Subunit: 28 residues, 4 copies
């Protein structure tokens, strides 16, 4: 459970980063 | 944006549904 | 594992579908 | 495309890494 909860939370955060990037181009 | 944005939000919701599944532990 | 593996496989499949839709640039 | 494309491929690979981790079952 706990390690997969961390990895899935990292997926939501990377998928949110692509929303942030699409609102301009490729933000870093 | 809008099409990819809706689908990225769907990926977050499926990944969050996966968090809710793991919390049952050793289920289906 | 088995259902979680199927859910994660569907994330790869939807995420790959967004590559296909991005390649058109002007489709939804 | 190219940035979002690279980053969706990073989602596929992080989701695939989760399959490889789930195959241990008793560890992480």
């Amino acid at each position: 459970i706990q390690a997969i909860k961390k990895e899935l939370t990292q997926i939501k955060q990377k998928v949110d980063s692509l929303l942030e990037n699409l609102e301009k181009i490729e933000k870093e």
